Amino acid sequence: PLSVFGDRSTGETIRSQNVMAAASIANIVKSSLGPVGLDKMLVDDIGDVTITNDGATILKLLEVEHPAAKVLCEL
Amino acid sequence: SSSEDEDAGEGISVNTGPKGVINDWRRFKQLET
Secondary structure, eight states: OOOOSSOOOOTHHHHHHHHHHHHHHHHHHGGGOSTTOOOEEEEOTTOOEEEEOOHHHHHHHSOOOOHHHHHHHHO | OOOSTTOOOOOOOOOSHHHHHHHHHHHHHHHHO
16 A cells, blocks of 8 residues: 555564664673673674774674664764 | 298556556566666
């Protein structure tokens, strides 16, 4: 009926999807909080290695596709 | 002896069907492009 060339998610489905994306972004860096947190070591596709504990650096180096996850990274 | 050789209406001008099927048409067209 709409005839829109795309996908549509409405209501509880999209709300749960956004919450899942935000929770995944949080859980990525939750292990690097506080004096007993531990660093993460990121490897690029060209073999470059970055070892960091900063949340901003981790979220900037990560390649993210979900819009809510992008919102959290920009936050 | 035994011893021997043996031994009409061509003009259609389809009206709305293309509108209905444009979804699948573009679905294939993106991959084809």
